[PDB]
Ligand binder design. Structure first.
Ligand SMILES: Cc1csc(NC(=O)C2CCN(C(=O)N(C)Cc3ccc(F)cc3)CC2)n1
Ligand SMILES: [Zn+2]
Length: 1333
């Protein structure tokens, strides 16, 4: 475009691109924090003379409506006045491509038609920070060759400029005559009057209405200094001094004029009130309301005789309305007609008409009409399985703990996982008492009996805690012990959980719960307090839904004001009607080309949505929900981010967030291919946020690209329309390919259901990539590179377009001084200064929001959870960050996983919720000038960056990245082991097919393969042992040896661990230790490390070494009473450690009186091709007198009933001789045995009783044999053993069997060693077994 500058009178200059009328304009520069409804906004007469800075960084998504259409009254149908009223517009990103069913044209076309200048590409947040609290900031949009001077339009009578010049009548023939004095009235005021039976006589600002006949009078505006409207003030003064008693209703300018006429004073506010999130309080009844405001002048708080304040601003204590003590005269400083904004104060129009209908009264007459004492509260933590629900982690319980501690309420927390991150807490988040018990009705009853709490929080531990609290309620246990449910009542909860009860409750307020395919899916997070104050804190739009695992953006992007405000209001109505006291999530389907919607569901407990919404906004939902449960109202709770304002507000976001689920694709489609984590990315364009989130999913992902990752090729036979219409693991790449193959966007939207707005942004990314591909290091301009970075291109992406390396591209970019900017997530779009340390990084800006004087220690997080990289690394993070804090070291945390506890800006000095790439970590490290980086405590992601960080100026703490590299290179590590005389299984990296075959024969079958391919001899019937350890200058100073239950196999990171060892020889232990001593010296280890070993009798073979903390670090730490991460962090930073009491190699800590077990929280089958495997995640860790009781306690802790009745036996035919003994053992403990016919017959022929059952695929073929499903449903089978079976005819049935157990919530054993452990433990052996601290 042509470019133009925004120049402020203080000297601030920002260059932007013109998208409106290309001429210069001068005016007052203002900002408004309201995000939605820019068409309604920019037609507000209040902006006359003003250049408006938009908080919402993404402007124009809905285009412009039909700007000439009129409604039945002769008013603009879709606008708030007869044209655009702003003098100009300043935005971060202008969407040239729009998509909305009411759009007729682009916002830029509209602006051009109206002659309004507008520029994009300017830092609207920086402009906000500059304008705020200055009173009047003059500025100008200036084009080259069109110089203009600063002018203050407030020095002229703007009221007169916008007022009607003659009397206009709307609602002709209606019964109630209302005179409206036009001080820049909005159209919606007139619509709301007429709807109520007014015939509205709209009169000029200076019309002498004083002797007119009317039933009521209304004054509304608008722009300008109310003091310049003396003829109006004098006329209103005449009314007030008369004996006229018609009701008077002032809106905004009305409030000021009515005040002045009464004898009050007005002033020009240092800090104006302009937003759609402005909290006010009715001073009379303490009720809070969220309002739309757009005023820069206010009434002085000293009011004249006969007048009282009606509303007050909750943030800044300014007047927000006045009322006469006896006459029906009142005004409000906000806009109850909204448009845009929250439809929460429309009842003021009802009040006005009520006053007219009586024969006199006050507005008070017709206006709408810590209490619980708790001394000890029981908080139900994150628990086990919930039948027909995915499996959840939810540690929000700890925020509840923190809230209770600030109110001097004693806390008891239940969490059965002894190594949970939730209980790894030592300050405000530590419960006074923790019980390590299952989250089940029996156990929670025992804690109630023991502790005698008077309150219970049941809505902050996921579905299982909820089901549990509800069951205690139903059985009378809560009544019996005097335990109050804090927050939403169980009666209200039951109404949301039962589909039918929910429908009936909704039908009472004329709302409703068929295919919603291709409807827009929008969700709101809502908080309601015990005083019936009810706010929306976040809203989200599903980009693409393929069970709650959608790609989501926040805020919603494609809604109009009408749609957004319609759903927002329904949310509030539904939440209040349901009796919510705390948080609630509500999900809508909205028809994509009308106003029709329906409610999909409500969730009256904390959820993945509420955790995402807290991360996206910085509003601490769980903490606030816990304060609400104590009956504290929103206005009386602090906004933790601002420090100076309350929880009674709706966040305004000057960035956009993108969340993407993390799919289970690491092992290498939808049948058993689930969401195992999530990422969230922040940007100030959609594109920036979007590419960043894609990269966050996995390091092989470059951004948005039509090329499959890992250099794979699209099939030659590809049917693209087919790929687009069914979920796949390559869906996003298929969309990119469709766009790039010139499939129309309309067709892509028809096939995918993704709104075309999003597809336009995707197309711009691909178009940028084409632009970049015709350029080179010499010809690419600064402007192009800047734009590419602003829409989320990485240096690596750019490098492939230009034919450069990544490093050369970074260098090139920094030579042009193109770098990103550190912004704060402040919850208020800069309305108030924040001192938050909750940060992101964007190219869309012109300043940083923080200083870089800390020079802190960086700690890198683990990225999205997935199989093998789970909650254990959150525990490691928490411990390492606390060690640093305890030693007085400033910390910088970087992570992008919104499910983590460690991304808590209250526990670290700077939290960057950012991409864990080399590029972004270097940006953050060098901008902060960090003193070092810890890459050892976040799993593989950070550790794999060791060497690239080290080569780019990063000080890595602890073990040299050069050593990490040697140890994790198979060829180098193996030659080091050869030289030290440490054994390992034979192995080869093979190029050719004839090489692979010759090796497989050189050492006998089988062999293991893994990604030029690595062959290793597979050793059969071996044990596996984990060594977790901490080195210091090459000396092992802490170690723990654990033993896998399962024989060494293809699964490791699926294995159940026993500590200390149970069936390992003493000689093998000595060899494990000796090998560990040698490895630590050979790699000069200073920090955490793990070595895995195969053991067979006395033969000990190293499998591999990971020179970083492993997932078993929490487990071994809690088991031995020594925090291995604490010790390692100390070593890595050079802090001294006393070794006298550590588990060194010469003096191990071997528990005597107990054994610990670590097992997966959730397991489920996966169909492959042909075979069936298990996947598992999460952790449960328990202690027991021995491994047998530990194991039973783990089973109860994961939410299972210990089997008693019947066992389904499924084994491969060749495994029969080995299994017969265990079968008899299980039978001799009183289990009835079931098996498929041939197995059943074989058992019976060996004198082990069994009952035959049908294979699922053959249930038709014989009505005489029982079905597995029926035997499970009726409780005959309460355990399924289903061991590996390579018979390909039954692979699918074995998958079905396994899926049935998992879905019915009964235990499923798929390994022989684990089956033997169970069999032994039930010989050996619910309440009795357990535990606590
Ligand atoms: C090895 C591995 C582990 S995880 C992984 N790849 C991913 O996680 C990708 C799969 C492709 N993918 C995808 O198709 N998505 C999420 C659909 C999508 C739809 C709309 C969007 F806006 C973005 C993504 C994203 C993540 N690869
Ligand atoms: Zn105000």
């Amino acid at each position: 475009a042509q470019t133009a500058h925004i120049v402020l009178e203080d000297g601030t200059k920002m260059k932007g691109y013109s998208f409106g009328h290309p001429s210069s304009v001068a005016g007052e520069v203002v900002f408004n924090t309201g995000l939605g409804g820019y068409p309604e906004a920019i037609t507000d007469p209040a902006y006359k003379g003003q250049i408006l800075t938009m908080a919402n960084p993404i402007i124009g998504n809905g285009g412009a409506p039909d700007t000439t259409a009129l409604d039945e009254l002769g008013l603009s149908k879709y606008l708030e006045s007869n044209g655009i009223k702003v003098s100009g517009l300043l935005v971060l990103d202008y969407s040239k491509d729009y998509n909305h069913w009411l759009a007729t044209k682009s916002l830029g076309q509209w602006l051009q038609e109206e002659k309004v200048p507008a520029i994009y590409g300017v830092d609207t947040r920086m402009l906000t920070k500059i304008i705020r609290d200055k009173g009047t900031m003059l500025g100008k949009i200036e084009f080259e060759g069109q110089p203009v001077d600063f002018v203050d339009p407030n020095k002229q009578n703007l009221i007169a400029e916008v007022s009607t010049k003659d009397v206009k009548v709307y609602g002709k023939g209606n019964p109630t005559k209302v005179v409206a004095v036009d001080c820049g009235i909005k159209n919606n005021v007139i619509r709301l009057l007429v709807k109520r039976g007014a015939e509205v006589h709209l009169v000029p600002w200076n019309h002498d209405f004083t002797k007119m006949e009317y039933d009521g009078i209304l004054i509304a505006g608008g722009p300008g200094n109310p003091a310049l409207a003396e003829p109006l003030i004098q006329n209103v003064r005449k009314i007030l001094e008369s004996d006229r008693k018609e009701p008077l209703f002032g809106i905004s300018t009305g409030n000021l004029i009515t005040g002045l006429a009464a004898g009050a004073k007005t002033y020009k506010m240092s800090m104006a009130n302009r937003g759609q999130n402005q909290p006010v309080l009715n001073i009379t009844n303490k009720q809070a309301f969220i309002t739309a405001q757009n005023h820069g002048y206010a009434l002085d708080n000293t009011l004249p005789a006969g007048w009282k304040p009606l509303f007050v601003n909750v943030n800044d204590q300014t007047n927000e309305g006045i009322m006469h003590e006896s006459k029906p005269f009142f005004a409000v400083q906000f806009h109850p007609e909204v448009t845009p904004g929250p439809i929460d104060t429309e009842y003021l129009f009802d009040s006005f008409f009520s006053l007219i209908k009586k024969g006199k009264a006050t507005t008070i007459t017709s206006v709408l009409p810590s209490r619980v004492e708790v001394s000890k509260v029981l908080i139900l933590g994150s628990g086990g399985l919930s039948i027909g629900q995915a499996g959840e982690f939810d540690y929000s319980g700890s925020q509840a703990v923190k809230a209770m501690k600030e109110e001097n309420v004693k806390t008891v927390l239940m969490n059965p996982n002894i190594a949970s991150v939730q209980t790894n807490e030592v300050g405000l988040k530590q419960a006074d008492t923790v019980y390590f018990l299952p989250i089940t009705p029996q156990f929670v009853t025992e804690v109630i009996k023991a502790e005698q709490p008077d309150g219970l929080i049941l809505g902050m531990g996921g579905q299982t805690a909820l089901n549990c609290g509800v069951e205690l309620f139903k059985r009378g246990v809560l009544k019996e012990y005097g335990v109050k449910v804090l927050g939403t009542s169980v009666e209200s909860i039951m109404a949301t959980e039962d589909r039918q009860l929910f429908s009936d409750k909704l039908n009472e307020i004329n709302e409703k719960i068929k295919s919603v395919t291709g409807w827009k899916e929008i969700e709101y997070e809502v908080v309601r307090d015990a005083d019936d104050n009810c706010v929306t804190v976040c809203n989200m739009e599903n980009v693409d839904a393929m069970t709650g695992d959608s790609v989501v953006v926040a805020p919603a992007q494609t809604l109009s004001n009408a749609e957004f405000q319609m759903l927002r209001r329904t949310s509030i109505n539904v939440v209040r009607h349901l009796g919510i006291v705390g948080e609630c999530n509500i999900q809508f389907a909205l028809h994509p080309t009308s106003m029709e919607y329906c409610i999909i569901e409500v969730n009256a407990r904390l959820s993945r949505s509420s955790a995402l919404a807290s991360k996206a906004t910085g509003y601490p939902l769980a903490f606030i929900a816990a304060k609400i449960a104590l009956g504290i109202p929103l206005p009386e709770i602090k906004n933790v981010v601002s420090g100076k304002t309350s929880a009674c507000f709706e966040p305004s976001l000057d960035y956009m967030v993108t969340k993407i689920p993390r799919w289970d694709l690491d092992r290498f489609i939808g049948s058993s291919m689930k969401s195992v984590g999530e990422v969230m990315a922040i940007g100030r364009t959609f594109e920036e946020s979007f590419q960043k989130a894609l990269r966050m999913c996995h390091p092989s992902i470059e951004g948005f690209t039509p090329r499959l990752p890992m250099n794979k090729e699209w099939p030659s036979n590809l049917d693209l329309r087919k790929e687009l219409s069914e979920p796949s693991s390559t869906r996003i790449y298929a969309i990119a390919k469709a766009i790039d193959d010139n499939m129309s966007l309309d067709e892509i939207e028809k096939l995918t259901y993704i709104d075309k707005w999003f597809l336009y942004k995707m197309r711009d990314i691909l178009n940028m990539e084409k632009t970049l591909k015709g350029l080179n290091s010499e010809s690419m301009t600064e402007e192009t590179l800047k734009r590419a970075k602003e829409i989320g291109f990485s240096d690596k992406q750019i490098s492939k377009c230009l034919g450069l390396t990544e490093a050369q591209t970074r260098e090139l970019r920094l030579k042009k001084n193109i770098h990103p900017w550190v912004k704060q997530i402040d919850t208020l779009a800069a309305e108030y200064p924040s001192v938050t340390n909750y940060l992101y990084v964007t190219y869309n800006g012109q300043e940083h929001d923080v200083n870089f004087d800390d020079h802190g220690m960086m700690v890198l997080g683990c990225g999205p959870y997935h199989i093998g990289s789970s909650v254990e690394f959150d525990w490691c993070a928490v411990s390492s960050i606390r060690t640093l804090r305890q030693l007085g070291k400033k910390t910088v945390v970087v992570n992008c996983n919104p499910e983590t506890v460690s991304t808590d800006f209250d526990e670290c000095d700077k939290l960057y919720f950012e991409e864990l790439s080399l590029e972004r970590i270097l940006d953050i490290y060098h901008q902060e000038a960090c003193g070092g980086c810890i890459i050892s405590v976040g799993g593989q992601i950070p550790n794999n960056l060791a060497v690239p960080l080290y080569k780019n100026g990063v000080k890595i703490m602890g073990t040299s990245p050069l050593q990490i590299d040697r140890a994790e290179d198979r060829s180098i590590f193996s030659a080091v082991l050869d030289e030290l005389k440490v054994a390992q299984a034979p192995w080869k990296a093979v190029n050719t097919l004839n090489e692979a075959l010759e090796f497989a024969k050189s050492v006998d079958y089988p062999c293991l393969l893994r990604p030029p391919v690595v062959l290793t001899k597979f050793v059969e019937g071996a044990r596996e042992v984990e060594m977790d350890a901490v080195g210091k200058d090459g000396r092992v100073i802490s170690h723990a040896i654990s033993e896998h239950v399962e024989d060494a196999g293809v699964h490791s990171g699926d294995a159940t661990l026993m500590l200390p060892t149970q069936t390992i020889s003493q000689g093998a232990i000595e060899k494990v230790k000796d090998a560990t001593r040698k490895i630590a010296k050979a790699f000069a280890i200073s920090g955490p490390f793990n070595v895995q070993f195969l053991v067979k009798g006395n033969d000990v073979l190293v499998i591999e070494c990971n020179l970083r903390a492993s997932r078993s670090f929490p487990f071994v730490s809690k088991t031995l009473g020594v925090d291995f991460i604490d010790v390692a962090t100390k070593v890595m930073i050079g802090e001294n450690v006393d070794e006298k009491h550590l588990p060194t190699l010469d003096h191990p800590i071997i528990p005597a009186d107990y054994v610990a077990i670590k097992a997966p929280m959730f397991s489920w089958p996966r169909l492959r091709d042909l075979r069936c495997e298990m996947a598992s995640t999460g952790e449960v860790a328990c202690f027991g007198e021995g491994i047998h009781t530990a194991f039973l306690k783990a089973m109860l802790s994961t939410g299972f009933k210990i089997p008693q009745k019947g066992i389904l036996i499924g084994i491969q035919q060749s495994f029969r001789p080995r299994f017969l003994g265990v079968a008899e053992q299980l039978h001799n403990e009183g289990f009835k045995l079931f098996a498929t016919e041939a197995t059943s017959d074989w058992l019976n022929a060996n004198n082990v009783p069994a009952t035959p059952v049908a294979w699922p695929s053959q249930e038709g073929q014989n009505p005489s044999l029982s079905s597995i499903r029926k035997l499970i449903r009726d409780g005959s089978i309460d355990l399924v053993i289903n061991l590996p079976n390579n018979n390909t005819k039954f692979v699918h049935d074995n998958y079905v069997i396994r899926r049935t157990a998992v879905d019915s919530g009964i235990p499923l054993l798929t390994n022989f060693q684990v089956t033997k452990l169970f069999a032994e433990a039930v010989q050996k052996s619910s309440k009795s077994l357990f535990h606590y601290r």
